């Protein structure tokens, strides 16, 4: 019942996490001078819409065209789930050996390989 | 924000 | 129950939280290399309790008495708790103008002050 806790904790700990950006416009400002693969940071949907289901957590990354983002959730029980912004349809995430940001990794840059390599 | 979905 | 998750936010991302150190052993070993006023860890008292009502962080010191330890907690509505851990009466905290982590901040340092001069 408190796994979502843990969950919250590798992610918050991490240093990819940003707990100072926000705004679309702070994202496009920190990948102005930075040259991270990519972030994470507080999702734009926990203040904004459903009632309370998941917490949400965004990633964010930068290829030639432009800056990319990725919604993320974390049920009360733990489990993972990318999140489809237009539809807010949910996909489980089966979280890998080394952990969740271990994982996390994999599902953004692997997704920014894709990306990249279709521009 | 620009996100990338799938389904 | 929504606010707990944004406090769990602030606590997880701030320095003093040290998520690899669990046991008395660790804490010691800390304190032993670094001159930190004070860490957050994960406390003992969230695996084995059955009571739903609070997510428990401690804080850990040093004095020249030995390490010390506060134990805190934070119900479903972010509101902050110190927790003796003798009776598991709580006291409530209210936030300072800065924010949880500033709170947090002056009640350890302040408990640490206090006491250093008993000795």
Known sequence: ?119 | PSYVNVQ
Chains 1, 3 share one sequence.
């Open chain 1, 1 to 119: 019942s408190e796994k979502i806790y843990k969950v919250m904790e590798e992610i918050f700990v991490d240093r990819h996490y940003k707990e100072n950006i926000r705004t679309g416009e702070e994202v496009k400002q920190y990948f102005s001078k930075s040259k991270a693969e990519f972030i994470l940071r507080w999702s734009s949907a926990n203040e904004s819409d459903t009632e309370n289901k998941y917490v949400f957590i965004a990633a964010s990354f930068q290829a030639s065209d432009g800056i990319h983002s990725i919604r993320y959730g974390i049920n009360k029980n733990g489990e993972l789930f990318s999140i489809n912004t237009a539809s807010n349809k949910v996909t489980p995430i089966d979280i890998l050996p080394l952990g969740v940001m271990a994982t996390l990794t994999q599902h953004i840059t692997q997704n920014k390989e894709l990306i990249e390599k279709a521009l």
